[PDB]
Amino acid sequence: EKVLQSLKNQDANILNSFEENLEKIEKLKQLEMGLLNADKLHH
């Protein structure tokens, strides 16, 4: 149980890092749709 608790403590910071990465991925996804719209406007 102790090893699991230590892994949970580390998996708090690890969870925060994973959530940040997920938000970065969502922002990049938004960016690609925006870029496609910008391309569409051109002619």
Partner 1 sequence: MKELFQKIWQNELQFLNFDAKFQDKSKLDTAECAIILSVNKDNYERYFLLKEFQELCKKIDLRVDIFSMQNAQICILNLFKSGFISKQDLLKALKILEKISKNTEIFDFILQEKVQSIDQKALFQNDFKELNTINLELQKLDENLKSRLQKTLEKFQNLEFNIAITGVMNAGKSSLLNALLKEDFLGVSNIPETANLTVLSYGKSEEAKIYFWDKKEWQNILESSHFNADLKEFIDKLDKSVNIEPLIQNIALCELKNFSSAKNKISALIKKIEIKSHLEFLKNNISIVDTPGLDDVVVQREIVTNEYLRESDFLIHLMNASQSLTQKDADFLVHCLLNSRLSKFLIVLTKADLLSKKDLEEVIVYTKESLKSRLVDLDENLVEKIDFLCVSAKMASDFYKGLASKESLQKSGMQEFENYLFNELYAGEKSKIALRAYKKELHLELKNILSEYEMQNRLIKENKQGVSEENQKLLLELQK
What counts of helices (H) and strands (E) characterise the chain? 1, 0
User: What's the min distance (Å) between Cβ of 3 and partner 1?
Assistant: 7
- Contact code string over 13-42 relative to partner 1, x by CB under 8 A: -x--xx--xx-xx-xx--xx-xx--xxxxx
| Half-sphere exposure in the Cβ direction for 24 (13 Å, CA) | 6
Tokens standing for 2? 């102790």
By CB under 8 A, name the binding residues for partner 1.
Answer: 3-4, 7, 11, 14, 17-18, 21-22, 24-25, 27-28, 31-32, 34-35, 38-43
